[PDB]
């Protein structure tokens, strides 16, 4: 089986919630990430994929970012990144984001497969890996998770 659609429904403890789409037409193309959350502060939140669909603990169980290839946190952009780091989205003045994203690192397929992991939106801005410091090469300090969900097939 391939994957060509995946969906994730982020929730926590408060006011944070949204549905999350990707798609994927082909194997070796871009994911298209998009979809909406509310209940944001206005600005930036970090946006990352983490290694495990799990909480069975909490934020340990879902592990740290996913990272197959071994190297340090940085933009979505930046060549030196890890696969799960898709930057920040941003919220408006009402706490809404509109996610619009386009990714060729993930994939809903292969090595570099989200599918069945944990899709998390922070409190704070992602750093890009800028921040000067060793919580910046591992998490670009987001701070705490305001929601998560497992990433699931949808088509
Ligand atoms: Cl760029
Ligand atoms: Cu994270
Ligand atoms: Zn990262």
Same mark, same amino acid.
């Given at each position: ?82 696969? !799960?780091?898709? $930057? #920040?989205?941003?919220?408006? *003045?009402? @706490?809404? /984001?509109?996610?619009?994203?386009? &990714?060729? %690192? +993930? ?21 890009? !890996?800028?921040? $000067? #410091?060793?919580?910046?090469? *591992?998490? @670009?300090? /987001?701070?705490?998770?305001?929601? &998560?969900? %497992? +990433?699931?097939?949808?088509?």
């Amino acid at each position: 089986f391939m994957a060509t659609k995946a969906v994730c429904v982020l929730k926590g403890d408060g006011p944070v919630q949204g549905i999350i789409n990707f798609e994927q037409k082909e194997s070796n193309g871009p994911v298209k990430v998009w979809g909406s959350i509310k209940g944001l502060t206005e600005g930036l939140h970090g946006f990352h994929v983490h290694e495990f669909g799990d909480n069975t603990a909490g934020d340990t169980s879902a592990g740290p970012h996913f990272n197959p290839l071994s190297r340090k946190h940085g933009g979505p952009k930046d060549e030196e990144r890890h696969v !799960g780091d898709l $930057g #920040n989205v941003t919220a408006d *003045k009402d @706490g809404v /984001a509109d996610v619009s994203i386009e &990714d060729s %690192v +993930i994939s809903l397929s292969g090595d570099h497969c989200i599918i069945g992991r944990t899709l998390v939106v922070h409190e704070k801005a992602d750093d890009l !890996g800028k921040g $000067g #410091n060793e919580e910046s090469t *591992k998490t @670009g300090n /987001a701070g705490s998770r305001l929601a &998560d969900g %497992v +990433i699931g097939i949808a088509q």
